[PDB]
Amino acid sequence: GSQIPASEQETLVRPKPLLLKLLKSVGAQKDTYTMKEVLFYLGQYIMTKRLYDEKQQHIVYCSNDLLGDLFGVPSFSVKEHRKIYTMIYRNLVVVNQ
C-alpha cells in the first residue's frame, strides 16, 4: 500500500509558517508533528475544500489555493506518495529522524 516506510512516517517535523497555518485551519494544535499527523490534517484540508476531481478523486487541483503555492504545482496525483512527501519536506524542518 504505502510507498513510504512506516519509520519515515514517524519523522518528527516543525512545519514552516504557511504550512503551519494550513494545518491549524483544520484543527492542528501543535508546533511540531510527526509526518503522519501532517498528512492527516493535509488530507482533511483537501477533503474539506473539495480540491480533488469529482470523477477521478486521486487528482487534486491546487493552482488557486495556498496548497499550490506550498507544493509549487497546479495539481498532483495522490498516488505519487514519494512526490507528495518531497513537496511536503520543503515546507518544514526535520526535528528528529
Binding site: I4, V78, K79, I84
Partner: peptide
C-alpha cells in the same frame, strides 16, 4: 476510488 481512500494509502 474516493479521495479519502487514495489519501489513506499514504499512511500505514
Amino acid at each position: 476510488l474516493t479521495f479519502e481512500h487514495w489519501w489513506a494509502q499514504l499512511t500505514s
